[PDB]
Write a protein that binds this ligand. Structure first.
Ligand SMILES: Nc1ccn([C@H]2C[C@H](O)[C@@H](COP(=O)(O)OP(=O)(O)OP(=O)(O)O)O2)c(=O)n1
Ligand SMILES: [Ca+2]
Ligand SMILES: [Ca+2]
Length: 411
DNA sequence: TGGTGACGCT
DNA sequence: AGCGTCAG
């Protein structure tokens, strides 16, 4: 009944902002946001601290409008390195966090600021030793128990007490051990980086990711098999990982529902007929809290790319500047690629050029030398047929986006 | 009116 | 190989 594994999702709280605040102490505990390119409307916001989220500041929001919402909003700038954003600060901080996380159990790099962790073996290893010694509530100073109890911190402690009181090879005891380990993990992350995070502990990846978002920030939530019916009864379908797009929308359309629990009243063959073999099976299992997607041992990315958008009147309409932006992208890609070669002992072998006209086109070619000029020229070569232009020195129709991606990595 | 990444389907 | 989807 999907209680074999113990899986945690650790995601950092307002991560880019925590990075900038670790760099600039004037920004700590203040309503502030991280911005991209001041010129257009003060810059698009990409990261909002919680003190600023209280005012209503959101991602994908021009900084100038956010200042209308919150006048006291402080802004920290993303580094700009070749006429384009440079995110190496946050990638290095991410690696900082991922290594600490790797010190406890096998992790799956899920994004720049979160990882899944498979804690089965560590829970067993701690359960064999420590003997029958109980679980002090002092071992979980930030854990919530979803559905308990049946002063926000008073609520928290009452639920934790109800859980610990009502407690061999029991899945709930496993979850408790893993939650203690995650408390440890997170205290280590905070002591060694200054960064704060939330976490979800459960039996699979999706339940862990939902639990991590139940109690943000700087808190962790345990979700047991038993909390699942109650939790899913009012859980909007779109909050589940991969049900936030078109598939999750049509599930609601066809089945005429609203929450996860209502998927239980359907047979597995029904949902397979509705959404496919692999999707019907997965939904039938998911609505009952069961998922088998494993925690893959992969801390390192599989692709390395740079894109630049050229919206509106700024799209590229000369070959003289398509050349130049391809060269800029190849430059940053090459710096990152040499760092990857010397840090991770592996080489990219295939280059992917992606372009858009007013990712409408993607081609691939050979990646043989970590050379910016070679790669820019080969990417150009690979895209020329697209230039409908009859005039030799213009480019029509203009390009809205350029994308360069090194992939197919060999040791 | 941004800049990335994993994965599925054919 | 190229496109479509999903999300941090
Ligand atoms: N559309 C997005 C989503 C994320 N990010 C970057 C900046 C974020 O700091 C980081 C991770 O984003 P999350 O969605 O995980 O959320 P935050 O880390 O900002 O905070 P929280 O998880 O507390 O909401 O990735 C981004 O630039 N654009
Ligand atoms: Ca986060
Ligand atoms: Ca996240």
């Amino acid at each position: 009944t999907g209680q074999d594994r113990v899986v945690a999702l650790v995601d950092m709280d307002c991560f880019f902002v925590q990075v900038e605040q670790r760099q600039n102490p004037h920004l700590r505990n203040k309503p502030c946001a991280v911005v991209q390119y001041k010129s257009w409307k003060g810059g698009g916001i990409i990261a909002v601290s919680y003190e600023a989220r209280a005012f209503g500041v959101t991602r994908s929001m021009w900084a100038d409008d956010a200042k209308k919402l919150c006048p006291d909003l402080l802004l920290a700038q993303v580094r700009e390195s070749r006429g384009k954003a440079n995110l190496t600060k946050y990638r290095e901080a991410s690696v900082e966090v991922m290594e600490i996380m790797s010190r406890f159990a096998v992790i799956e790099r899920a994004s720049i600021d979160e990882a899944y962790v498979d804690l089965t073996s560590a829970v067993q290893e701690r359960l064999q030793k420590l003997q029958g010694q109980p679980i002090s509530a002092d071992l979980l100073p930030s854990t919530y128990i979803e559905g308990l109890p049946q002063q926000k911190e008073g609520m928290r402690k009452q639920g934790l007490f109800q859980w610990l009181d009502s407690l061999l090879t029991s899945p709930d005891l496993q979850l408790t051990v893993g939650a203690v380990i995650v408390e440890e993990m997170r205290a280590a992350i905070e002591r060694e980086t200054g960064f704060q995070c939330s976490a979800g502990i459960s039996h699979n990846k999706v339940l862990a990711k939902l639990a991590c978002g139940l109690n943000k920030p700087n808190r962790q939530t345990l979700v047991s098999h038993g909390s699942v019916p109650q939790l899913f009864s009012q859980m909007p379908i779109r909050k589940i990982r991969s049900l936030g797009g078109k598939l999750g929308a049509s599930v609601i359309e066809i089945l005429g529902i609203e929450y996860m629990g209502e998927l239980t009243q359907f047979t597995e063959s029904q949902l397979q007929s509705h959404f496919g073999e692999k999707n019907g099976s997965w939904l039938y299992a998911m609505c009952r809290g069961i998922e088998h997607d494993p925690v893959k041992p992969r801390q390192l990315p599989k692709t390395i790319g740079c894109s630049k958008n050229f919206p509106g009147k700024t799209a590229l309409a000369t070959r003289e500047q398509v050349q130049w932006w391809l060269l800029q992208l190849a430059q940053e890609l090459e710096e990152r690629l040499t760092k990857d070669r010397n840090d991770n002992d592996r080489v990219a072998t295939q280059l992917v050029v992606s372009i858009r006209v007013q990712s409408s086109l993607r081609r691939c070619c050979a990646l043989t030398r970590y050379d910016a000029h070679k790669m820019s020229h080969d990417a150009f070569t690979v895209i020329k047929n697209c230039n409908t232009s009859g005039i030799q020195t213009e480019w029509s129709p203009p390009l809205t986006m350029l994308f360069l991606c090194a992939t197919k990595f060999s040791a």
